[PDB]
Design a protein around this ligand. Structure first.
Ligand code: NAG
Lengths: 49, 50, 50
């Protein structure tokens, strides 16, 4: 689970916060990335920590 | 029709706080890429808001 | 839930196929056919045609 600003960061050839320190994909990667919004299930009014 | 232009100069620009300041999706650039903006540098930056 | 559309949580599932070098284990739904020889036929061996 990531934030909405960094969904496009899950791609071959990306740098920053998620792609450099958390989850890096190879340059010659073959496969599919499936992302969808989960604001109903993974959010709380007090703040999901 | 009366868009405001702000001149940015004589400073150090960090582009990683743009995602923190505003809740957008795509940082859509044309002559550059979003991930390489912190390495090289420019003369002047203008901001146009409407 | 009061945040903007760029700060919503997102679930990401990444499927990572590896191309065929070892004998194939996972394959899609297709009916197999009897093997014929010494004839000009179109073949399909583990997804590659000819
Ligand atoms: C914008 O500025 C106001 C006033 O300084 C502040 O209360 C608000 O939190 C700021 N917004 C963000 C996203 O930081």
């Amino acid at each position: 689970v990531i934030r909405g600003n960094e969904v496009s960061q899950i791609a071959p050839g990306q740098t920053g916060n998620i792609a450099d320190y958390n989850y890096k994909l190879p340059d010659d990667f073959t496969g599919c990335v499936i992302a969808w919004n989960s604001n109903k299930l993974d959010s709380k009014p007090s703040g999901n920590y | 029709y009366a868009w405001n232009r702000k001149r940015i100069s004589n400073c150090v620009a960090d582009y990683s706080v743009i995602y923190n300041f505003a809740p957008f999706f795509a940082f859509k650039c044309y002559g550059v890429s979003p991930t390489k903006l912190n390495d090289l540098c420019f003369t002047n930056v203008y901001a146009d808001s409407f | 839930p009061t945040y903007g559309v760029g700060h919503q949580p997102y679930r990401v599932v990444v499927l990572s196929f590896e191309l065929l070098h070892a004998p194939a284990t996972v394959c899609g739904p297709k009916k197999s056919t009897n093997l014929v020889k010494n004839k000009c036929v179109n073949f399909n061996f583990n997804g590659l045609t000819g």
